[PDB]
């Protein structure tokens, strides 16, 4: 469905940040795309009672739909809607409509 | 001893008249420039002038 696995370096689309870098992410099958370029401060106080009594009043993910700049190699987007063949046995991921598997 | 039609409104709201509460009004007494409660000297130490209950 998403295919975009971890370390998959994508780019921000749709809005807000936009045109930002971001890679890896933490998307999951029917899960969420943390990426790196989506996150405004955060809300949190000093609840932790451990020797590391922090506040977590900072840092956090900004879900956003999987609809981000497709992986992108040269410019941007470049839909990966193609399927390789006779490679692997499980999968056979292809890539942008520019070249072939990448 | 049964009743039959009774007007919640108006009526009863009238008997409530004799139901409001009331106000005290009392002093502080020489020492306590406040409390003194009612016709008592003061509770802080429960003394009218000295060794009564607990004081100096």
């Amino acid at each position: 469905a998403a295919k975009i696995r971890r370390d998959d370096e994508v780019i921000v689309l749709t809005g807000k940040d936009k045109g930002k870098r971001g890679k890896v992410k933490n998307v999951l099958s029917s899960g969420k795309v943390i990426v790196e370029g989506i996150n405004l401060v955060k809300k949190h106080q000093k609840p932790v009672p451990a020797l590391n009594q922090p506040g977590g009043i900072v840092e956090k993910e900004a879900a956003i739909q999987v609809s981000n700049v497709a992986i992108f190699n040269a410019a941007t987007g470049k839909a990966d809607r193609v399927g390789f063949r006779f490679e692997d046995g499980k999968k056979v991921r292809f890539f942008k409509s520019n070249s072939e598997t990448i | 001893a049964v009743q039959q039609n009774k007007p919640t409104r108006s009526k009863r709201g009238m008997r409530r008249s004799h139901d409001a509460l009331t106000a005290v009004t009392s002093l502080s007494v020489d020492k306590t420039s406040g409390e003194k409660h009612l016709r008592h000297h003061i509770t802080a130490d429960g003394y009218y002038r000295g060794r009564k209950v607990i004081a100096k």
Binding site: - | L21, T22, A23, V24, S26
Partner: protein
């Protein structure tokens, strides 16, 4: 909110608490007690607590240290009433609603 405090539940019925409230209005404030501390009815012990909490909110939400103020408002409302049963004449005369209220005290300017 122009420094409030109010309540909710606890249980003390409406009219029961609505009686002691009438005792305090207008001047109030400096009357955090006496016109209340010298009246014993459960309803009284409850309105005073929230009375102080309210007058206390005068050091947090707004300034105006405790000394002026007025308490131009005090009204209790009917709060959800608990239901229970009561063994009696085989089970006919049994309803028992615990009833409860609040107080909602206020302290504005004169």
């Amino acid at each position: 909110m122009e420094t409030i405090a109010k309540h909710r539940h606890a249980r003390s019925s409406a009219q029961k608490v609505r009686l002691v409230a009438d005792l305090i209005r207008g001047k109030k404030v400096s009357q955090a007690l006496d016109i209340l501390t010298y009246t014993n009815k459960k309803a009284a012990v409850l309105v005073k607590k929230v009375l102080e909490s309210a007058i206390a909110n005068a050091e947090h939400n707004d300034g105006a240290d405790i000394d002026d103020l007025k308490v131009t408002k005090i009204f209790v409302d009917e709060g959800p009433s608990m239901k229970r049963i009561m063994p009696r004449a085989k089970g006919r005369a049994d309803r028992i609603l615990k009833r409860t209220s609040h107080i909602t005290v206020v302290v504005s300017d004169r």
